[PDB]
Design an enzyme around this catalytic site. Structure first.
Site, short mmCIF file in Angstrom:
data_model
loop_
_atom_site.label_atom_id
_atom_site.label_comp_id
_atom_site.label_asym_id
_atom_site.label_seq_id
_atom_site.Cartn_x
_atom_site.Cartn_y
_atom_site.Cartn_z
N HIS A 1 0.95 -1.73 -0.24
CA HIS A 1 -0.18 -0.22 0.17
C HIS A 1 1.23 1.23 -0.07
O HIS A 1 0.87 2.41 0.12
CB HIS A 1 -0.48 -0.22 1.42
CG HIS A 1 -2.04 -1.34 1.31
ND1 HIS A 1 -3.43 -1.17 0.33
CD2 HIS A 1 -1.91 -2.78 2.29
CE1 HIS A 1 -3.63 -2.30 0.90
NE2 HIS A 1 -3.37 -2.55 1.78
N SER B 1 -0.59 -1.62 -6.20
CA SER B 1 -0.45 -3.37 -6.45
C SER B 1 -0.03 -3.15 -8.52
O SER B 1 -0.47 -1.78 -8.87
CB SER B 1 -1.62 -3.90 -6.96
OG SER B 1 -2.76 -3.46 -7.54
N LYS C 1 -15.54 -8.62 -6.33
CA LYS C 1 -14.53 -9.78 -7.22
C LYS C 1 -14.32 -10.70 -5.41
O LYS C 1 -14.13 -11.80 -6.38
CB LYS C 1 -14.15 -8.41 -7.45
CG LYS C 1 -13.25 -10.12 -8.71
CD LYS C 1 -12.91 -8.69 -9.59
CE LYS C 1 -11.74 -9.81 -10.70
NZ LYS C 1 -11.05 -8.91 -11.89
N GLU D 1 3.65 -34.76 1.66
CA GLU D 1 2.05 -34.82 1.28
C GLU D 1 2.37 -33.35 -0.43
O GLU D 1 3.83 -33.66 -0.66
CB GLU D 1 0.86 -33.49 1.48
CG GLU D 1 0.44 -34.50 2.58
CD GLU D 1 -0.37 -35.84 2.41
OE1 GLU D 1 -0.66 -35.45 1.50
OE2 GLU D 1 0.05 -36.93 2.88
#
Ligand code: HEM
Ligand code: HEM
Ligand code: DY2
Lengths: 319, 58, 98, 370, 72
Positions: free
Chosen positions: D192, D196, D218, D262
């Site tokens: 911030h 972005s 969204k 895993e």
């Protein structure tokens, strides 16, 4: 015809600087898309260049007919004196027309939209937001003129400052959120614009549209008789003070005979005012402000301007 | 006018009224959905669940 | 031939399909912002529109018709004359310290 | 006057064009908060002792009112929590967001902080693959000279994985997420300051938009779809990504046939099994992760995105295949066809990142007369 | 940072409507579909081939893995 052609192109360049006139012209373009009302009085510079004598004789021979026109006057004369001259001169008008020569006006399509003419070079930011109006003859015009009058109007030259009554004007003078604003109600044949105009620095818009919309929704939900009474006393004085001089009186005669068909005396306006109270205002504003799709306009550094879904978000409350 | 316009004028206009619809809707929705959902599952798995066979062992 | 290869790569990249020029895309950087600041208003205010249009396309995930795409031979290098100046100034500052 | 901080959620400037790929940053904010609530309610019925842990899961999955859903919203709530990363990272590499160094280097520190937490979390049920997973993987530090025999016994609290190894994982596990939550708010803080990135890599100061009506809804959409793919596994294939040998309690005297972590580690494991030299295998393992911190020092193209870098696109999606390979090889046993493949893919992973992808943008600059 | 002074813009215009006055699904099938195929062909040759290559080494490695375990 060719001289004034050059003059009017010079006028448009001047009116390109009258930022106020630009906004309303942008505003009508967006509220009244796809209709004549989106047009300007002056029209585009193209038609100014691409015009003919023939285009005008068509326009004049079509529209200027006695039935659609009005002579009216005021001052130290007599009605009877006016008639003897009307018959002397105005008996020669074309009081008739072909089967379909005179057009008629259909309603026009209001729409909810925004126009954002970005120009950071200019130091101030003109804004104008509004909604669909009733029209001339619709009786609730009276109540709205009060509602606007409650909000009032402001410039940075008014010496009241914080102590003013309109809590918008009170806040604006305190925090210097703006230099100016007002409240208009433009009335057309069966519709109109209702809203406000304001000027402010580019770092101060978001604060205004949060308080302006608050006062509208304040009235739609809760308004007191005192401030309504405060608004009513303003509307009384405006009509009286506006009618001072032979010129504005015969204006009031002329258009009222075209808009309403008759004239309304101040006694009847007062009678219509008298039927107003807080309940009326809450309802009428709720019809025409609360949760509607307005028209928005901007010109200048409007970067801070809330996007229309935020403007529209603030046209209601969660209360 | 249409139904949608009538619904808005009475219910979706006031946010107070609005919310009460949603609770009211949830109750009758919670009831209606569970009945219909179970009926499908049982219809698929007919004769395989306990209650479908429970009568034999009382 | 390499010129034909440079041309194909240009169309392959596709920033012509958004109406952009080359210099509109360069990585925002200190040497660059200096160069951008020195642009004139005409050329600058054009850069902003070429960008803001393109972003409005990628939002919609659309492009322009072939008639508006940027042509390879028309790829103006409007920023390099000012940028190569700045980088020259930088190397003097470094060389002067040494 | 907190809610000046909520301007990062309401009135925040954000670009206009950004597609679904950026939502995966927010979804971690949901998975994380989701996973903490679930794992907490598992703590109410879990026991950290070896004689009682494996049963404790049974108490949940059998006797508790809807205890069982919480186990599977939580286990598979970790799997989806890494589909989100690996796509959340691939964005940052493909669209070139790694130029925000302050965030990226913290993006790494979140990753490690997590990808050890799942390791600890996979032990707690105390089955075979849990135990033997931790038995193999801790011993790798034994490869280090002069320390490993001391450090591993320290981590174990003994000389093999046993009670005190378990109980401390439960405490190292049920804490770090509260540390991860801090670093996220940090991670955003440096974001911030810069705002972005977009698919283009271009400064988007001109076409910014608010965040409150637009990306919120969204994210509500993107969050909803996430809850689908989670609950499908919970409600239609819960043992899918699992490993059934885990449902046998730990038997340190009976090694399972297939030891493996895993699915979300396996590409790391394949790199390790590739190299025969033990210690040299380890430094490859840790380097497969830490190499992200070498990306920005290997940026070469004067562009940022890869929508406008054809050759890097072809190499990027090749890297994905190399990963998917390594995920597959690690899950599969070690024999002459798979050994050979696992070697080649691992070399590509380091080669492709360090050499070709930088080399590409250099070439791409040359075609553009740069 | 905040709105208002992020950068400088001049002589740019934006027009927009109210969402209550326009369809949310305009030409959703009529126009959206070929855009997808256009969006597809524009990129698919760069995404496919390594994954195409993967499917082969998956099978060939799988079969060769099987054959290794069978017999002389
Ligand atoms: C934040 C990153 C986390 C990751 C990657 C992660 C991953 C895992 C995984 C994969 C398991 C295996 C569960 C199973 O196989 O059934 C597990 C177990 C467990 N987790 Fe999470 N977890 C995380 C956070 C948490 C949090 C925040 C809590 C509690 C608030 C928690 C509580 C537990 C507990 C008690 C177990 C053992 C109980 C059981 O597995 O049945 N974990 N963890
Ligand atoms: C618990 C783990 C994480 C949390 C809570 C988290 C949270 C977020 C959020 C909400 C965003 C904004 C949305 C976005 O830009 O995509 C973001 C951005 C970003 N994240 Fe994370 N993230 C995590 C893991 C990571 C990891 C593992 C990396 C790198 C390895 C990373 C690198 C980045 C970068 C570079 C950005 C900014 C990219 C841009 O704005 O263009 N993040 N993070
Ligand atoms: C433009 O890209 C950005 C840029 C900045 C961002 C940022 O600073 C934050 C804090 C976040 C975020 C992080 N965690 C969780 C959420 C969240 C969103 C909706 C929810 O609502 C529900 F529907 F329930 F999921 C619940 C949580 C958002 N997302 C950012 C996305």
């Amino acid at each position: 015809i060719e001289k004034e052609r050059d003059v009017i192109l010079q006028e448009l360049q001047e009116n390109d600087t009258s930022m106020r006139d630009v906004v309303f012209n942008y505003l009508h373009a967006t509220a009244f898309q796809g209709t004549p009302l989106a047009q300007s009085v002056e029209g585009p510079s193209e038609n100014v260049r691409k015009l003919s004598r023939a285009d005008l004789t068509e326009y004049l021979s079509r529209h200027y007919k006695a039935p659609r026109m009005v002579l009216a006057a005021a001052g130290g004369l007599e009605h009877r004196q006016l008639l003897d001259l009307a018959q002397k001169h105005f008996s020669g008008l074309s009081g008739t027309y072909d089967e379909d020569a005179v057009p008629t006006l259909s309603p026009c399509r209001f729409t909810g939209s925004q126009i954002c003419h970005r120009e950071d070079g200019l130091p101030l930011a003109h804004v104008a937001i509004a909604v669909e109006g009733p029209g001339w003859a619709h009786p609730d015009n009276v109540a709205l003129q009060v509602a606007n009058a409650i909000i009032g109007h402001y410039d940075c030259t008014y010496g009241g400052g914080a102590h003013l009554s309109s809590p918008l004007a009170s806040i604006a003078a305190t925090n210097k959120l703006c230099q100016s604003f007002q409240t208009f109600n433009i009335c057309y044949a069966d519709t109109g614009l209702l809203g406000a105009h304001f000027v402010c620095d580019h770092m101060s818009i978001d604060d205004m549209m949060f308080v302006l919309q608050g006062q509208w929704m304040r009235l739609c939900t809760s308004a007191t008789e005192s401030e309504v009474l405060r608004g009513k006393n303003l509307l009384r004085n405006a009509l009286v003070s506006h009618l001072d001089g032979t010129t504005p009186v015969c204006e009031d005669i002329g258009r009222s005979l075209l808009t309403y068909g008759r004239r309304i005396p101040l006694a009847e306006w007062e009678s219509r005012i008298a039927e107003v109270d807080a309940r009326v205002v809450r309802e009428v504003c709720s019809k025409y402000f609360y949760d509607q799709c307005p028209a928005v306009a901007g010109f200048g550094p409007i970067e801070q301007l809330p996007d229309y879904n935020r403007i529209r978000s603030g046209m209601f409350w969660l209360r | 006018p249409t139904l949608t316009a009538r619904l808005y004028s009475l219910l979706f206009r006031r946010t107070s009224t609005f919310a009460l619809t949603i609770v009211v809707g949830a109750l009758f929705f919670e009831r209606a959905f569970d009945q219909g959902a179970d009926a499908i599952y049982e219809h698929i798995n007919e004769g395989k669940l306990w209650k479908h066979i429970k009568h034999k062992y009382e | 031939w390499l010129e034909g290869i440079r041309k194909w790569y240009y169309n392959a990249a596709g920033f012509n399909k958004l109406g952009l020029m080359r210099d509109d895309t360069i990585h925002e950087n200190d040497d660059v912002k200096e160069a951008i600041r020195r642009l004139p208003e005409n050329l600058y205010d054009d850069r902003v529109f070429r960008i803001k249009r393109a972003l409005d396309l990628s939002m919609r995930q659309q492009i322009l018709p072939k008639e508006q795409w940027t042509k390879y031979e028309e790829d103006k290098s409007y920023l390099e004359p000012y940028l190569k100046e700045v980088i020259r100034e930088r190397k003097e500052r470094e060389e002067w310290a040494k | 006057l907190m809610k000046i901080v909520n301007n990062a959620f309401i009135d925040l400037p954000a670009p206009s064009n950004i597609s679904s790929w950026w939502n995966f940053g927010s979804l971690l904010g949901i998975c994380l908060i989701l996973q903490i609530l679930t794992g907490l309610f598992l703590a109410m019925h879990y026991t950290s002792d070896t004689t009682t842990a494996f049963s404790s899961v049974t108490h949940i999955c059998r006797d508790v009112n809807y205890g069982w859903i919480i186990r599977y919203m939580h286990a598979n709530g970790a799997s989806m929590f890494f589909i989100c990363l690996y796509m959340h990272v691939g964005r940052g590499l493909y669209y070139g967001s790694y130029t925000f160094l302050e965030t990226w280097n913290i993006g790494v520190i979140l990753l490690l902080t997590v990808m050890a937490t799942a390791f600890m979390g996979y032990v707690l049920p105390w089955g075979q693959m849990s135990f033997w997973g931790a038995t193999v993987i801790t011993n790798l530090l034994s490869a280090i000279p002069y320390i490993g025999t001391n450090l591993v016994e320290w981590i174990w609290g003994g000389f093999s994985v046993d009670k005190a190894t378990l109980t401390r994982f439960f405490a190292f596990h049920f804490i770090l997420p509260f540390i991860i939550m801090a670093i996220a708010m940090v991670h955003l803080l440096f974001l911030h300051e810069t705002g972005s990135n977009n698919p283009t890599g271009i400064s988007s100061d001109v076409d910014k938009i608010p965040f409150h009506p637009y990306y919120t809804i969204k994210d509500i959409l993107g969050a909803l779809l996430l809850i689908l793919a989670l609950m499908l596994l919970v409600l239609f294939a819960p043992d899918l990504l699992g490993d059934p040998d885990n449902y046998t309690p730990a038997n340190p005297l009976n090694t399972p046939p297939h030891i493996k972590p895993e699915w979300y580690f396996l590409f790391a494991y394949a790199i390790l099994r590739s190299i025969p030299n033990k210690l040299g295998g380890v430094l490859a393992l840790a380097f497969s992760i830490l190499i992200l911190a070498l990306i920005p020092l290997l940026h070469t193209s004067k562009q940022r995105s890869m929508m406008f870098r054809p050759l890097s696109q072809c190499l990027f999606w090749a890297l994905v295949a190399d990963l998917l390979t390594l995920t597959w090889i690690g899950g599969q046993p070690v024999e002459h066809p798979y050994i050979t493949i696992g070697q080649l893919a691992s070399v590509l992973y380091f080669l492709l990142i360090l050499v070709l992808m930088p080399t590409a943008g250099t070439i791409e600059n040359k075609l553009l007369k740069w | 940072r905040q709105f208002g002074h992020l950068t400088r813009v001049r002589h740019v215009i934006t027009y927009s409507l109210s969402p209550f006055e326009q369809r949310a699904f305009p030409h959703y099938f009529s126009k959206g579909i070929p855009n997808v195929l256009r969006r597809t062909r524009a990129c698919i040759l760069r995404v496919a081939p390594p994954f195409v290559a993967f499917y082969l080494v998956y099978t060939w490695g799988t079969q060769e893995f099987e054959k290794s375990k069978r017999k002389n």
